[PDB]
Design a protein around this motif. Structure first.
Motif, short mmCIF file in Angstrom:
data_model
loop_
_atom_site.label_atom_id
_atom_site.label_comp_id
_atom_site.label_asym_id
_atom_site.label_seq_id
_atom_site.Cartn_x
_atom_site.Cartn_y
_atom_site.Cartn_z
N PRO A 132 0.80 -1.30 -0.05
CA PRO A 132 0.06 0.02 0.07
C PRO A 132 0.81 1.23 -0.03
CG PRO A 132 -1.08 -1.74 1.35
CD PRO A 132 0.40 -2.17 1.18
N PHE A 133 2.16 1.08 0.55
CA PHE A 133 2.95 2.31 0.61
C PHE A 133 3.77 2.61 -0.46
CE2 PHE A 133 6.34 -0.31 2.24
CZ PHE A 133 5.75 -1.25 2.78
N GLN A 134 4.19 1.46 -1.08
CA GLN A 134 5.04 1.54 -2.15
C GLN A 134 4.56 2.08 -3.71
OE1 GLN A 134 5.98 -2.93 -2.28
NE2 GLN A 134 7.43 -2.78 -1.15
N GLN A 135 5.79 3.02 -3.96
CA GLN A 135 5.55 4.03 -4.92
C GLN A 135 6.21 3.66 -6.43
OE1 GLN A 135 3.24 6.33 -4.47
NE2 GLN A 135 3.15 5.30 -2.52
N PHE A 136 7.12 3.00 -6.34
CA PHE A 136 7.85 2.38 -7.35
C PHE A 136 8.84 1.31 -7.39
CE2 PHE A 136 12.18 4.01 -6.64
CZ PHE A 136 12.16 5.16 -5.73
N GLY A 137 9.29 0.38 -8.45
CA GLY A 137 9.98 -0.92 -8.31
C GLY A 137 11.05 -0.86 -8.99
N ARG A 138 12.01 -1.81 -8.48
CA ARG A 138 13.61 -1.85 -9.12
C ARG A 138 13.69 -3.27 -9.73
NH1 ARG A 138 16.88 3.06 -8.06
NH2 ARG A 138 16.42 4.22 -6.26
N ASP A 139 14.45 -3.17 -10.96
CA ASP A 139 15.22 -4.42 -11.21
C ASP A 139 16.41 -4.94 -10.39
OD1 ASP A 139 15.78 -6.57 -13.16
OD2 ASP A 139 16.60 -4.83 -14.60
N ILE A 140 16.90 -6.03 -10.62
CA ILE A 140 18.01 -6.64 -9.79
C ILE A 140 19.14 -5.63 -9.59
CG2 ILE A 140 19.68 -8.44 -9.62
CD1 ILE A 140 16.69 -9.42 -9.39
N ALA A 141 19.55 -4.72 -10.72
CA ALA A 141 20.67 -3.74 -10.58
C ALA A 141 20.29 -2.36 -10.73
CB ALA A 141 21.71 -4.38 -11.43
N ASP A 142 19.64 -1.84 -9.90
CA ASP A 142 19.21 -0.27 -9.43
C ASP A 142 18.10 0.04 -10.39
OD1 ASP A 142 21.55 -0.33 -7.63
OD2 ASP A 142 22.48 1.48 -8.53
N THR A 143 18.06 -0.42 -11.43
CA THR A 143 17.12 0.50 -12.63
C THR A 143 15.63 0.32 -12.28
OG1 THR A 143 18.87 -0.14 -14.36
CG2 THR A 143 16.85 0.26 -15.33
N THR A 144 15.10 1.21 -12.24
CA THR A 144 13.53 1.53 -12.03
C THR A 144 12.61 0.66 -13.08
OG1 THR A 144 13.60 3.69 -11.03
CG2 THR A 144 11.57 3.13 -11.81
N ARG A 158 3.91 3.20 -9.55
CA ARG A 158 2.44 3.30 -9.45
C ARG A 158 1.91 4.72 -9.94
NH1 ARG A 158 -0.66 0.74 -5.70
NH2 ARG A 158 0.76 0.37 -4.01
N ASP A 159 0.93 4.82 -10.65
CA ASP A 159 0.04 5.97 -11.17
C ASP A 159 -0.21 6.69 -9.54
OD1 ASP A 159 -1.25 7.99 -12.10
OD2 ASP A 159 -3.06 6.91 -12.46
N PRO A 160 -0.13 7.94 -9.57
CA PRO A 160 -0.35 8.47 -8.11
C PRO A 160 -1.99 8.94 -8.38
CG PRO A 160 1.03 10.15 -9.50
CD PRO A 160 1.00 8.79 -10.08
N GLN A 161 -2.50 9.00 -9.44
CA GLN A 161 -3.79 9.42 -9.57
C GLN A 161 -4.89 8.30 -9.30
OE1 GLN A 161 -4.69 12.29 -12.68
NE2 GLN A 161 -3.15 13.55 -11.73
#
Ligand SMILES: *[C@@H]1O[C@H](CO)[C@@H](O)[C@H](O)[C@H]1NC(C)=O
Lengths: 49, 50
Positions: free
Chosen positions: A1-13, A17-20
């Motif tokens: 519920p709190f998470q806004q974005f996710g990453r690959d194994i090596a740093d890369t976004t 989440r669409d904020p609207q």
């Protein structure tokens, strides 16, 4: 519920989440690669692929 | 991120045909397919050779 974005194994976004809404979108990087020219010899033809 | 991976020229299916060819030569014809055309020989006699 709190998470806004996710990453690959090596740093890369790799997702956001669409904020609207609340939808999670995967990101795929721009399509890219080498242009390579396939040719007979210029001594025999000028057609290329 | 600007990195690219390129395919092998021979696919895993093509390599699996070469390993079948070397094996089917080795079973039917001994070392002869390494010297010229494959010459058939019965497998018990190829082991008798070896
Ligand atoms: C934001 O507004 C849209 C309508 O424009 C609505 O459909 C959506 O549920 C809202 N999201 C929230 C509660 O932030």
């Amino acid at each position: 519920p709190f998470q806004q974005f996710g990453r690959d194994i090596a740093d890369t976004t790799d997702a956001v989440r669409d904020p609207q809404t609340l939808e999670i979108l995967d990101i795929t990087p721009c399509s890219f690669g080498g242009v390579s020219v396939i040719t007979p010899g210029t001594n025999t033809s000028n057609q290329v692929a | 991120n600007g990195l690219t991976v390129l395919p092998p020229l021979l696919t895993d299916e093509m390599i699996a045909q070469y390993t079948s060819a070397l094996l089917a030569g080795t079973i039917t014809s001994g070392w002869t397919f390494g010297a010229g055309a494959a010459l058939q020989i019965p497998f018990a006699m190829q082991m008798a050779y070896r």
